[PDB]
Amino acid sequence: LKLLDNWDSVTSTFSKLREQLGPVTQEFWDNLEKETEGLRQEMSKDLEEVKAKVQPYLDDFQKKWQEEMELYRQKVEPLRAELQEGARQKLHELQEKLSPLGEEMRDRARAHVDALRTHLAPYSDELRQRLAARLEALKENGGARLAEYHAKATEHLSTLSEKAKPALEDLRQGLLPVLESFKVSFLSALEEYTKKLN
Amino acid sequence: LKLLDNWDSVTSTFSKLREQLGPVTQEFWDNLEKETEGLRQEMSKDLEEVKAKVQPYLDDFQKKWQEEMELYRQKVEPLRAELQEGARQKLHELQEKLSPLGEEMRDRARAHVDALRTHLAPYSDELRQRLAARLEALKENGGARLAEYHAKATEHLSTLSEKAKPALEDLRQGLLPVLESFKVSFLSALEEYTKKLN
Amino acid sequence: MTEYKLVVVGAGGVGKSALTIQLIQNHFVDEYDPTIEDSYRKQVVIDGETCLLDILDTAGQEEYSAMRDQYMRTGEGFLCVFAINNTKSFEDIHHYREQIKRVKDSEDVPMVLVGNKCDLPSRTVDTKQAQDLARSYGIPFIETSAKTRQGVDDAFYTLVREIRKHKEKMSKDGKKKKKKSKTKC
Amino acid sequence: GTVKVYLPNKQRTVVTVRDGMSVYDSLDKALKVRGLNQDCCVVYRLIKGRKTVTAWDTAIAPLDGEELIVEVL
Ligand SMILES: CCCCCCCC/C=C\CCCCCCCC(=O)OC[C@H](COP(=O)(O)OCC[N+](C)(C)C)OC(=O)CCCCCCC/C=C\CCCCCCCC
Ligand SMILES: CCCCCCCC/C=C\CCCCCCCC(=O)OC[C@H](COP(=O)(O)OCC[N+](C)(C)C)OC(=O)CCCCCCC/C=C\CCCCCCCC
Ligand SMILES: CCCCCCCC/C=C\CCCCCCCC(=O)OC[C@H](COP(=O)(O)OCC[N+](C)(C)C)OC(=O)CCCCCCC/C=C\CCCCCCCC
Numbered sequence: 080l081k082l083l084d085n086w087d088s089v090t091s092t093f094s095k096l097r098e099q100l101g102p103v104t105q106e107f108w109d110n111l112e113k114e115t116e117g118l119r120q121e122m123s124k125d126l127e128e129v130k131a132k133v134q135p136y137l138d139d140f141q142k143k144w145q146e147e148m149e150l151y152r153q154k155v156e157p158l159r160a161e162l163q164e165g166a167r168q169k170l171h172e173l174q175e176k177l178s179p180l181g182e183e184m185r186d187r188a189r190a191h192v193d194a195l196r197t198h199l200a201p202y203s204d205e206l207r208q209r210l211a212a213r214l215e216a217l218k219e220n221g222g223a224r225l226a227e228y229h230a231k232a233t234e235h236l237s238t239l240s241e242k243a244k245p246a247l248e249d250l251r252q253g254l255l256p257v258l259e260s261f262k263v264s265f266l267s268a269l270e271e272y273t274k275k276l277n
Numbered sequence: 278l279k280l281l282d283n284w285d286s287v288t289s290t291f292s293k294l295r296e297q298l299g300p301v302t303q304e305f306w307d308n309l310e311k312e313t314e315g316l317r318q319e320m321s322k323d324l325e326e327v328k329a330k331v332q333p334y335l336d337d338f339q340k341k342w343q344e345e346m347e348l349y350r351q352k353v354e355p356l357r358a359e360l361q362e363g364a365r366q367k368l369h370e371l372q373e374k375l376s377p378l379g380e381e382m383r384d385r386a387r388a389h390v391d392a393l394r395t396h397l398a399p400y401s402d403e404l405r406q407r408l409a410a411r412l413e414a415l416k417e418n419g420g421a422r423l424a425e426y427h428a429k430a431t432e433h434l435s436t437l438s439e440k441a442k443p444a445l446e447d448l449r450q451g452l453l454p455v456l457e458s459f460k461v462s463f464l465s466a467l468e469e470y471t472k473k474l475n
Numbered sequence: 476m477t478e479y480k481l482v483v484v485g486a487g488g489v490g491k492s493a494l495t496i497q498l499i500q501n502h503f504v505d506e507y508d509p510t511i512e513d514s515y516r517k518q519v520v521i522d523g524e525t526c527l528l529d530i531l532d533t534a535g536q537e538e539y540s541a542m543r544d545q546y547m548r549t550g551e552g553f554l555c556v557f558a559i560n561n562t563k564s565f566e567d568i569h570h571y572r573e574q575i576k577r578v579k580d581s582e583d584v585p586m587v588l589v590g591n592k593c594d595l596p597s598r599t600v601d602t603k604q605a606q607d608l609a610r611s612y613g614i615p616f617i618e619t620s621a622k623t624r625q626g627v628d629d630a631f632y633t634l635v636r637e638i639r640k641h642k643e644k645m646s647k648d649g650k651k652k653k654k655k656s657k658t659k660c
Numbered sequence: 661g662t663v664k665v666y667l668p669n670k671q672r673t674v675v676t677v678r679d680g681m682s683v684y685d686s687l688d689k690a691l692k693v694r695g696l697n698q699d700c701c702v703v704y705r706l707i708k709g710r711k712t713v714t715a716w717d718t719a720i721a722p723l724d725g726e727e728l729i730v731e732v733l
């Protein structure tokens with residue numbers, strides 16, 4: 080309601096801002112004119128300075144690039160050749176190493192896997208009997224536990240009857256007057272709050 | 278009142294739970310004993326068979342492992358020799374490359390750096406002139422910037438004071454009845470808060 | 476790659492630093508080393524098995540520090556080093572036993588009684604008296620001398636064997652036998 | 661009054677801070693006990709979580725509070 084009075088001061092604030100938006104911004108533009116003029120005194124020389132330097136720079140760089148490229152060509156080629164022969168020697172080494180070791184590894188695998196074929200096979204079979212006996216134990220006690228659980232579930236359901244019936248009715252018998260009392264407190268609160276929030 | 282009866286049902290449940298857990302832990306343990314006894318008997322054969330068989334298992338594996346290690350060491354010697362002799366050539370030939378190609382690198386680096394010296398020296402010197410021009414403009418423009426900024430700041434301070442006092446006093450003057458009316462509503466609303474929760 | 480933590484406790488003057496340094500770089504000290512918290516780690520072959528031993532040599536003049544209590548818990552085996560020429564040390568052995576019992580939260584902890592300076596002419600603690608005390612605790616007694624290097628390594632070897640003994644026993648005690656498992660530990 | 665210096669052997673040692681002896685002297689007992697020499701070893705200070713290069717010639721007096729880590733070069 081009184082916001083009009085407060086906002087009126089905001090309008091005055093806008094006016095004060097507009098006063099600055101004029102000469103201050105205009106002055107800023109005048110400063111910008113100095114900035115642009117300055118840049119036209121800096122960049123004018125800078126750009127030419129760059130051009131007059133980039134040319135010999137790229138030229139000197141080209142010289143260095145040439146030195147590097149030529150030098151590298153006279154290095155990469157012979158080195159690659161030597162590395163190739165060295166790699167071929169390494170390859171031959173690898174071949175002459177991985178071949179006997181490969182055959183050996185295959186026999187190693189034979190001696191290991193065939194061993195496993197005669198180690199894990201009876202092991203799994205033994206485990207099968209062991210697991211079977213264990214399964215029977217789990218089924219014996221499990222089947223019993225199922226009966227026990229069913230009995231306990233029955234006891235639990237029976238002990239739940241005294242909760243889902245009398246206790247639930249008791250809760251309902253409590254909820255009725257409670258909700259009523261809550262309603263009285265809520266209704267009054269609604270009116271009371273509305274009266275002060277109007 | 279509600280909590281008293283509700284919690285009563287809780288204790289009337291904990292008791293039943295305790296009366297249930299009693300035989301439950303026993304029945305569970307009885308079944309657990311049957312299982313664990315069987316597991317023990319089973320584990321007796323399990324561990325014994327595993328240990329009795331682990332002996333020839335390890336013996337078989339170690340036997341082959343001996344061959345694996347022996348043949349490995351047997352071949353490791355000539356293989357290491359191939360690596361050593363081969364590397365001797367590879368490294369020696371490379372050392373014979375790092376020498377001339379290294380000298381060439383240094384010689385190329387000489388021209389590389391020396392050409393850089395004859396370029397970077399005047400480049401940085403001329404850059405000093407460029408930077409001088411930049412700094413000159415930055416100083417001259419800066420002097421204006423600061424002068425204008427001071428002017429703009431003064432203009433800002435003028436409108437600032439026109440708001441820090443008149444507008445602020447308007448706000449503060451309004452804050453008086455506003456805060457008071459708010460206090461009136463808050464203090465009165467506080468009645469409901471207490472008369473509804475106690 | 477098996478590393479064991481050995482803590483050497485004792486009164487100031489017994490020469491804990493000397494004992495440890497003698498095993499590490501094999502050099503006898505001559506100055507009063509103001510040891511507070513210094514560890515020494517070396518690797519040796521004990522009974523055919525390679526073991527890394529990290530010996531913690533701490534101050535023997537601390538009252539009751541929380542930092543001490545904490546680092547005492549990280550020690551597996553404990554060496555009760557006392558001087559055969561110092562009656563106070565023989566009586567203070569019980570203090571070490573109780574301190575370790577509390578920090579380890581167990582009464583059955585591998586410990587070894589070490590009687591250093593047995594080469595010295597001065598002897599107030601007889602071998603039987605010390606051995607009897609050790610026997611009462613259920614631990615072995617080793618007479619040592621850092622000056623003559625006698626029993627030095629032996630004491631350490633014994634401690635490692637006690638640690639092994641305890642761990643082996645617990646592993647072959649009764650896992651499938653259901654001997655104290657619980658759920659909240 | 662006591663500072664714990666970290667050793668390159670993955671350990672540490674607590675020494676007493678004195679207003680006389682230098683780093684070289686204080687770290688001498690630490691290196692000599694590990695069979696090391698102050699020729700290939702360098703000590704690093706603890707400032708802002710990161711380590712800082714320090715000299716042996718410097719005294720140990722201003723080393724009261726922080727900890728040091730010795731490395732081998
Ligand atoms: C065809 C091409 C193939 C080439 C041909 C084949 C020939 C070349 C042959 C061999 C290559 C060298 C590699 C072997 C090095 C093993 C060093 C090592 O372990 O020896 C064992 C010693 C012994 O232990 P100890 O007695 O001291 O401990 C005792 C414990 N105490 C604390 C408890 C008391 O240990 C020591 O001497 C301490 C270990 C410190 C030495 C580390 C050296 C590691 C090897 C190379 C460095 C490479 C760096 C890679 C650079 C790449 C950057 C991108
Ligand atoms: C280049 C850009 C063009 C500018 C255009 C707008 C302005 C034109 C109009 C008037 C000119 C006024 C400019 C003068 C500003 C001075 C800044 C300055 O020199 O200040 C320094 C002070 C000193 O305190 P200290 O920290 O050194 O000491 C800490 C103490 N202890 C040491 C113990 C560590 O610092 C302080 O007063 C800290 C407070 C900083 C206040 C900044 C407010 C700036 C106002 C307007 C800019 C517009 C932002 C708009 C955002 C729109 C985004 C879309
Ligand atoms: C020029 C230089 C040439 C030199 C030649 C030398 C050749 C080196 C070649 C191979 C080395 C294989 C390394 C085997 C690693 C296990 C070592 C081992 O037995 O150590 C023992 C630890 C024991 O327990 P602890 O010490 O921790 O406990 C005690 C803790 N205490 C001490 C604080 C109390 O056992 C453990 O740590 C068990 C954990 C094992 C995890 C290893 C992680 C390996 C990482 C990466 C492998 C790369 C995969 C890349 C894919 C390649 C595709 C082609």
Ligand SMILES: CCCCCCCC/C=C\CCCCCCCC(=O)OC[C@H](COP(=O)(O)OCC[N+](C)(C)C)OC(=O)CCCCCCC/C=C\CCCCCCCC
Pocket residue numbers: 548578579580658659660
């Ligand atoms: C988000 C990604 C999903 C995947 C999640 C992970 C999967 C689950 C599997 C494995 C994680 C297991 C967590 C354990 C981690 C290690 C904690 C630790 O570092 O452990 C070591 C501490 C050592 O002791 P210390 O050094 O302090 O003492 C020594 C001092 N003294 C002797 C001197 C006085 O061990 C202690 O503190 C002992 C207590 C810690 C043992 C806790 C095991 C509890 C087991 C069962 C309880 C189940 C209740 C079920 C009911 C349901 C409720 C909702």
Ligand SMILES: CCCCCCCC/C=C\CCCCCCCC(=O)OC[C@H](COP(=O)(O)OCC[N+](C)(C)C)OC(=O)CCCCCCC/C=C\CCCCCCCC
Pocket residue numbers: 316317320579580581650651655656657658660
């Ligand atoms: C939420 C739903 C989960 C569903 C999963 C169900 C399956 C889980 C059931 C069983 C598997 C668990 C097996 C491993 C148990 C270890 C738990 C553990 O690490 O807990 C940590 C506590 C820590 O406290 P602390 O006492 O160590 O520390 C105080 C130290 N102070 C005395 C020394 C100084 O450790 C302790 O409580 C001591 C360790 C207890 C020793 C157990 C031995 C187990 C061995 C064999 C199992 C036998 C099976 C039967 C045979 C069948 C063969 C087929």
Ligand SMILES: CCCCCCCC/C=C\CCCCCCCC(=O)OC[C@H](COP(=O)(O)OCC[N+](C)(C)C)OC(=O)CCCCCCC/C=C\CCCCCCCC
Pocket residue numbers: 667668669670730731732
């Ligand atoms: C990312 C790899 C690139 C991929 C390329 C493929 C090729 C990989 C093949 C070969 C690479 C060989 C790398 C050799 C590694 C060196 C480890 C080592 O020696 O490094 C040194 C650090 C030093 O620290 P310090 O305290 O000893 O020195 C303090 C002492 N100063 C002050 C005195 C000097 O030592 C340490 O960091 C302690 C030991 C290292 C522990 C690493 C633990 C890593 C974590 C988990 C492993 C995950 C296994 C996953 C398996 C999953 C199965 C499903």
Ligand SMILES: CCCCCCCC/C=C\CCCCCCCC(=O)OC[C@H](COP(=O)(O)OCC[N+](C)(C)C)OC(=O)CCCCCCC/C=C\CCCCCCCC
Pocket residue numbers: 706708709710711
């Ligand atoms: C993406 C846009 C960001 C743009 C903003 C730029 C700012 C971020 C850049 C740089 C920040 C520099 C901060 C370094 C200061 C660390 C000081 C320090 O030393 O403070 C201590 C902590 C704790 O360690 P400490 O004291 O035990 O060890 C030191 C061992 N002493 C104490 C014995 C000597 O030091 C540490 O936490 C050491 C740090 C290791 C933590 C690694 C965590 C990596 C995980 C997530 C980071 C994700 C990066 C994503 C990549 C995207 C790039 C675009």
Ligand SMILES: CCCCCCCC/C=C\CCCCCCCC(=O)OC[C@H](COP(=O)(O)OCC[N+](C)(C)C)OC(=O)CCCCCCC/C=C\CCCCCCCC
Pocket residue numbers: 707708709710711712
């Ligand atoms: C153009 C050509 C110019 C010429 C210049 C050369 C080229 C540029 C080259 C490199 C730039 C990298 C700068 C260095 C970075 C440091 C990394 C680092 O190692 O740091 C760690 C340090 C603290 O460790 P310390 O070892 O020194 O201290 C321990 C004390 N002692 C010494 C006693 C041991 O950290 C500190 O000092 C604190 C640093 C915190 C990092 C703040 C960066 C935040 C970045 C972005 C904020 C986002 C703005 C929003 C973006 C919107 C844009 C529109």
Ligand SMILES: CCCCCCCC/C=C\CCCCCCCC(=O)OC[C@H](COP(=O)(O)OC[C@H](N)C(=O)O)OC(=O)CCCCCCC/C=C\CCCCCCCC
Pocket residue numbers: 268269272273276
């Ligand atoms: C006494 C009790 C005390 C107990 C108090 C308990 C605390 C309760 C607290 C909060 C309750 C609020 C609980 C809010 C729950 C959220 C309800 C909800 O989902 O709302 C959604 C709406 C969305 O509107 P939009 O429909 O326009 O559509 C979404 C959007 N534009 C789009 O394009 O997608 O948002 C709106 O509500 C806007 C509707 C505006 C209409 C009204 C416009 C207002 C009209 C008139 C104002 C009165 C006039 C006064 C003038 C007199 C001056 C003198």
Ligand SMILES: CCCCCCCC/C=C\CCCCCCCC(=O)OC[C@H](COP(=O)(O)OC[C@H](N)C(=O)O)OC(=O)CCCCCCC/C=C\CCCCCCCC
Pocket residue numbers: 706707708709710726
């Ligand atoms: C629109 C514009 C928006 C702009 C947004 C800008 C955002 C800028 C954000 C961040 C700026 C980077 C600010 C970097 C601050 C770096 C602070 C730092 O290096 O602290 C060091 C300390 C180390 O204490 P110590 O006691 O260990 O060391 C000795 C002590 N300092 C001494 O001098 O004697 O560490 C500690 O305090 C202990 C805690 C260690 C755990 C943490 C370790 C990790 C520590 C630092 C990492 C900083 C991470 C920064 C990444 C931020 C990205 C989300």
Ligand SMILES: CCCCCCCC/C=C\CCCCCCCC(=O)OC[C@H](COP(=O)(O)OC[C@H](N)C(=O)O)OC(=O)CCCCCCC/C=C\CCCCCCCC
Pocket residue numbers: 704709710711712731
């Ligand atoms: C980070 C990746 C992590 C993943 C790792 C995966 C594999 C891990 C396994 C094995 C590999 C091990 C990888 C280990 C990586 C780092 C290991 C490491 O932390 O080493 C220590 C050193 C320095 O230690 P200090 O104790 O001396 O210093 C104190 C320390 N910073 C501190 O805060 O306390 O720090 C440094 O590395 C020195 C940095 C110097 C800055 C210059 C840096 C220079 C950078 C770039 C140069 C490029 C130039 C190319 C030129 C062109 C060629 C012609």
Ligand SMILES: Nc1nc2c(ncn2[C@@H]2O[C@H](COP(=O)(O)OP(=O)(O)NP(=O)(O)O)[C@@H](O)[C@H]2O)c(=O)[nH]1
Pocket residue numbers: 486487488489490491492493494504505506507508509510511533534535536591592620621622
């Ligand atoms: N005769 C003899 N002297 C020893 C023996 N052990 C240490 N000493 C001597 O006792 C002095 C201090 O030894 P030290 O090992 O530093 O004692 P510590 O009790 O471990 N020091 P701290 O109490 O400060 O931790 C040295 O002069 C040293 O030579 C020993 O077994 N026999």
